Amino acid sequence: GTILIDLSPDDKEFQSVEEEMQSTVREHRDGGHAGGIFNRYNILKIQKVCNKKLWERYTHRRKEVSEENHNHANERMLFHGSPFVNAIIHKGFDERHAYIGGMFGAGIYFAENSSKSNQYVYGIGGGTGCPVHKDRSCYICHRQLLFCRVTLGKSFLQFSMAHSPPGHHSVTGRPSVNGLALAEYVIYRGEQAYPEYLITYQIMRPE
Ligand SMILES: CC(C)c1ccc(-c2cc(=O)c3ccccc3o2)cc1
Ligand SMILES: [Zn+2]
């Protein structure tokens, strides 16, 4: 049921998605080990992911969360990087996309920093890098991230598939050391995220 619509680079919607991608790059404490050394990306394509059944699955669950939280879905747009992006865009998020060893338990993880999600495109810790060159910092191979609509509801604040903490719909990992890191988030129901945009890109070698 999924169809992909290409956005023109002249479209305001392409431009605002690119800006979120580029402006949320940061340096990582691994010095680029997992995701590569770069300060910006070359955006190659931005596609809208359209699937009626998966959308309705998302909005059904969003209403349930909203009704449990004074009519407030607490909806965000967040990045997700995964070796399973093709499964996700066709069949939705489910328990097979959960980070089983994540620091906030077995759930599906999302990031404000695009560069954090970039660290997972080739797997946990960057795996062995790109399939073709076995390079986690490959500047040639095309990568894909998802920019996702995510329902947080009442989020458990952690300063720093399972179930949400009792009385909560998600977990927030608040950075408590790296002053420049943005928040990361975990949901425990695949129906709480819709993979809105598929972004194809390369990391760029700093000059
Ligand atoms: C290969 C397994 C299934 C997997 C594990 C973690 C991720 C993932 C993806 C993210 O975008 C992310 C963002 C912030 C913190 C952790 C994150 O982890 C994706 C797939
Ligand atoms: Zn490569």
Give me a quick take on this structure.
The protein has helices at 12-23, 52-67, 85-91, 114-118; strands at residues 3-6, 41-50, 75-80, 108-111, 143-151, 155-159, 170-174, 184-187, 193-203.
- Supply the number of helical segments: 4
List SSEs in N-to-C order: EHEHEHEHEEEEE
Q: Write out the distinct hetero groups bound to the structure.
A: 4'-isopropylflavone, zinc ion
The first-level CATH class is given as: Alpha Beta
Distance between termini? 43 Å
Strand content: 25-35%
Estimate percent helicity: 10-25%
Number of self-contained structural domains: 1
Q: At the third CATH level, what is the topology name?
A: Phosphoenolpyruvate Carboxykinase, domain 3
Sheet with the most strands: spatial strand order: 1-2-9-5-3
CATH architecture: Alpha-Beta Complex
Biggest sheet descriptor: 5 strands, antiparallel
Binding site for Zn(2+): 130, 133, 138, 141
Subcellular location: Cytoplasm; Golgi apparatus membrane; Nucleus; Chromosome, Telomere
Domain PARP catalytic: 8-207
Family: Belongs to the ARTD/PARP family.
Task: Looking at this protein, list some descriptive labels.
207 residues, alpha+beta, Phosphoenolpyruvate Carboxykinase, domain 3, five-stranded antiparallel sheet, 4 helices, 9 strands, 28% strand, binds 4'-isopropylflavone
